[PDB]
Swiss-Prot record, chain A:
Full-sequence range covered: 1 to 97 of 165
GO molecular-function terms, A-Z: RNA binding; structural constituent of ribosome
Cellular localisation: Cytoplasm; Nucleus, Nucleolus
Phosphotyrosine PTM positions: 12
Post-translational modification: Methylated by PRMT5. Methylation is necessary for its interaction with NPS1, its localization in the granular component (GC) region of the nucleolus, for the proper assembly of ribosomes, protein synthesis and optimal cell proliferation. Monoubiquitinated by ZNF598 when a ribosome has stalled during translation of poly(A) sequences, leading to preclude synthesis of a long poly-lysine tail and initiate the ribosome quality control (RQC) pathway to degrade the potentially detrimental aberrant nascent polypeptide. Deubiquitinated by OTUD3 and USP21, antagonizing ZNF598 activity. Deubiquitinated by OTUD1, antagonizing ZNF598 activity and stimulating formation of polysomes: deubiquitination by OTUD1 promotes stability and translation of a subset mRNAs with a high abundance of rare codons can limit the translation rate.
One GO term describing the cellular component: focal adhesion
Keyword field contains Amino-acid biosynthesis: no
Physiological role: Component of the 40S ribosomal subunit. The ribosome is a large ribonucleoprotein complex responsible for the synthesis of proteins in the cell.
Keywords: Cytoplasm, Diamond-Blackfan anemia, Isopeptide bond, Methylation, Nucleus, Phosphoprotein, Ribonucleoprotein, Ribosomal protein, Ubl conjugation
One GO biological process term: translation
Protein name (database record): Small ribosomal subunit protein eS10
Presence of the UniProt keyword Cytoplasm in the record: yes
Species name: Homo sapiens (Human)
From Swiss-Prot, chain B:
Consequence recorded when altering residue 4 to A: No effect on phosphorylation by CDK1. Greatly reduced phosphorylation by PRKCD. Abolishes phosphorylation by PRKCD
GO molecular function (one): microtubule binding
EC supergroup of this enzyme: lyase
Residue numbers carrying Phosphothreonine: 40, 68, 218-219
N6-acetyllysine carried by residues: 60
PTM per Swiss-Prot/TrEMBL: Methylation by PRMT1 is required for import into the nucleolus and for ribosome assembly. Sumoylation by SUMO1 enhances protein stability through increased resistance to proteolysis.
Reactions this protein catalyses: 2'-deoxyribonucleotide-(2'-deoxyribose 5'-phosphate)-2'-deoxyribonucleotide-DNA = a 3'-end 2'-deoxyribonucleotide-(2,3-dehydro-2,3-deoxyribose 5'-phosphate)-DNA + a 5'-end 5'-phospho-2'-deoxyribonucleoside-DNA + H(+)
Effect of residue 193 to A: No effect on phosphorylation by PRKCD
Annotated protein name in UniProt: Small ribosomal subunit protein uS3
Provenance organism: Homo sapiens (Human)
Domain KH type-2: 19-90
Phenotypic consequence of residue 225 to R: Does not affect ubiquitination in response to ribosome stalling
Origin: domain of life: Eukaryota
Cellular component, GO, one term: membrane
Length: 97, 225
RNA sequence: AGGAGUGGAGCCUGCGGCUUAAUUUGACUCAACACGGGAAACCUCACCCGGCCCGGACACGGACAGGAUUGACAGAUUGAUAGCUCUUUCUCGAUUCCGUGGGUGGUGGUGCAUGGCCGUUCUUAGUUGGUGGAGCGAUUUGUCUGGUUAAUUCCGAUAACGAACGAGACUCUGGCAUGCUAACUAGUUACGCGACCAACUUCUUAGAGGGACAAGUGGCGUUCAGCCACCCGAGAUUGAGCAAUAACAGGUCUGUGAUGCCCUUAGAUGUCCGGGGCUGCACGCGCGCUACACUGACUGGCUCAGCGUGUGCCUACCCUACGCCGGCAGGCGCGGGUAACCCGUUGAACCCCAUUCGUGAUGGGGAUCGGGGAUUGCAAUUAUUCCCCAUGAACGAGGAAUUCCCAGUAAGUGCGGGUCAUAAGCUUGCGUUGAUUAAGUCCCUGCCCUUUGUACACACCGCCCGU
């Protein structure tokens, strides 16, 4: 919450570009171990991630102070319906198969 | 860049513990038994033991590539540095973790606990185990929780031999009523070689080599044709 | 008829009794009370004189280029360079807000819904099938008359026979090698100097081994199990760890998207060197801080101990080797050590001693409390931070009640880890000095292996009688 729309689209191209990620719950602290130096404020990026994975339509699992994600196709369908980005631009994650 | 040997050993132990918990909480349904991290010059190869391997690799090795990638991006290894395999376990019937998961997934669907516990106990015994005991504690309807225990065979509790003759698994089963915890203890048989059981025998067990039947005449007489 | 050290003589904490911002959650004998590894300014304070940035996958309502966000010293605030001043119409700019809860949850309830961990009954030796005997049966035998053992340990006996746990064995730890495996961080031999005036490894380190078995002897023991004593021996019941089903409405939901929902509030048990207490003294209690004489401490006049710790995923925080010099930690330059390499053969320490007690208030061990430069922690006082002037305190075995303890016990004494900013009066370990009494008993408190009684079974905190 308390999240601007430019940071929204920023976190959304981050989700588009990465897909499969790992993370840790950090909010107040000003430097980050593995998801810092992204030219965007840490707090708004992490709160937008909170919105992404806790809005109520993609499930999570919280343990050992870290996050591992299964990004369902319902979320992909929501993204395609909202931003109108077709899946024909496949993620580059399908290499080294 | 460098830390002392005490810190290094402790960090290696923490890495092993967190990796084990991670691939315990991920694929407990896949028959996962345990992890074993092997050192290799400038490498860290990982072996996963599971009763079901087609399901940990999946189609086209999807699950393996995903969880290898997340372990890579998590544990600070350089790009493309972690490679884990998935091999079957030669002792499926007398591994405590595997049998605990088997009970938890026999109970998660909603079933009578006595039938499942007796089936698991019978299967462990028919796997050559020296003895077992299964404890299931939790809610069985009512204002009170009960603990019912199923034993068969012989089992030790005290001393050092319990460290290498008994393997224990404690698991939580989440039902809509609440949580029931299961406890599977298996007393491994004594077997030299094969890694099925401990190499040393029970320290209170003394062995004697057995002679054979000797019914012989009074004096040996050579016989020639 | 033993004692030693006690809670009363030298380093404040826990929770209730107990004025308003002060006696603040969980834990009601052992089995609560430096216990939640909980050393409270504050992030963890809910007893707290005070607030703001506030929440809804939905059930229904108020409707769009404005419906406000921590964010100004000097007129102030109720401590506070917090715009909260009934104040500017500065400032990310559609972020959001109000009424009820499921929610991305609440260190929010319920541990009388649970899991898992512990603690305890219960430190003792206890416990249970199968088959076979007995009984209509609950149930009993096995699991025992005796002797023996620390032991349901064994001998033995025997309607029981075969077994399974627990006990033992086991693991770790100490104690011992004219032995073994080898070290440029301990340790060294006559073609060695800086001195007639590259030892096939042993003190330290640590390994495949050895060594102790009531083994030898003597005496007690259906001459069995075993017990006592004595040589020899490094050592002759030798530290701990682990530890049986049934147990308890024992503690923990405040360790854990470990976990089942009845359910408050906007003053979320979020932040921000910010901020009252609890650091009072008629004590309401509990754990703690302390040695009585030529023994206590100084001459600084000989090589002393550890057990251990020590510097980037996080991260901004490590242990320490000379001089400014009053008399040394030390405000600043300086190197070493990710460590048997440096601290350090452990850098403001023995218990000793030509500062001394001639018979005990003196020199002998400190009632406060003042200065010398303070390690540098905003604050410390509403917990951090040295020895000296000898200023004289019942100045030499202690209401009722009692807690711990049998040899390297106790006690004295310092040191290191945890907590941490080198924060300890706490705890967890470690050495150092060093031990009076006892090798017994069932009297008190309890426990166990039997027989017996019972009107008890919520099991004596029971049950129960009487106008």
């Amino acid at each position: 919450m308390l999240m601007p729309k430019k940071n929204r689209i920023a976190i959304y191209e981050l989700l588009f570009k990465e897909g499969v990620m790992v993370a840790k719950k950090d909010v107040h602290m000003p430097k980050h171990p593995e998801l810092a130096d992204k030219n965007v404020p840490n707090l708004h990026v992490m709160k937008a991630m909170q919105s992404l994975k806790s809005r109520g339509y993609v499930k999570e699992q919280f343990a050992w102070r870290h996050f591992y994600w299964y990004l369902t196709n319902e979320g992909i369908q929501y993204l395609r319906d909202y931003l109108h980005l077709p899946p024909e631009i496949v993620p580059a994650t399908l290499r080294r198969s | 860049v460098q830390i002392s040997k005490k810190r290094k050993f402790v960090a290696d132990g923490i890495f092993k513990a967190e990796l084990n918990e991670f691939l315990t909480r991920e694929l407990a349904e896949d028959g996962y038994s345990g992890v074993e991290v092997r050192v290799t010059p400038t490498r860290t190869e990982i072996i996963i033991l599971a009763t079901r391997t087609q399901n940990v690799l999946g189609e086209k090795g999807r699950r393996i590539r995903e969880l290898t990638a997340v372990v890579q991006k998590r544990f600070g290894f350089p790009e493309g540095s972690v490679e884990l395999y998935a091999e079957k376990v030669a002792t499926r019937g007398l591994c405590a973790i595997a049998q605990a998961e088997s009970l938890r997934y026999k109970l998660l669907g909603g079933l009578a606990v006595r039938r499942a516990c007796y089936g698991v106990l019978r299967f462990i015994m028919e796997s050559g185990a020296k003895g077992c005991e299964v404890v299931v504690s939790g809610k069985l309807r009512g204002q009170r929780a009960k603990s019912m225990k199923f034993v068969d065979g012989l089992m030790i509790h005290s001393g050092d031999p319990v460290n290498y003759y008994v393997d224990t698994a404690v698991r939580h089963v989440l039902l809509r009523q609440g949580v029931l915890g299961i406890k599977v203890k298996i007393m491994l048989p004594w077997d030299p070689t094969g890694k099925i059981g401990p190499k040393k025998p029970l320290p209170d067990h003394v062995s004697i080599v057995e002679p054979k039947d000797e019914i012989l005449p009074t004096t040996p007489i050579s016989e020639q044709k």
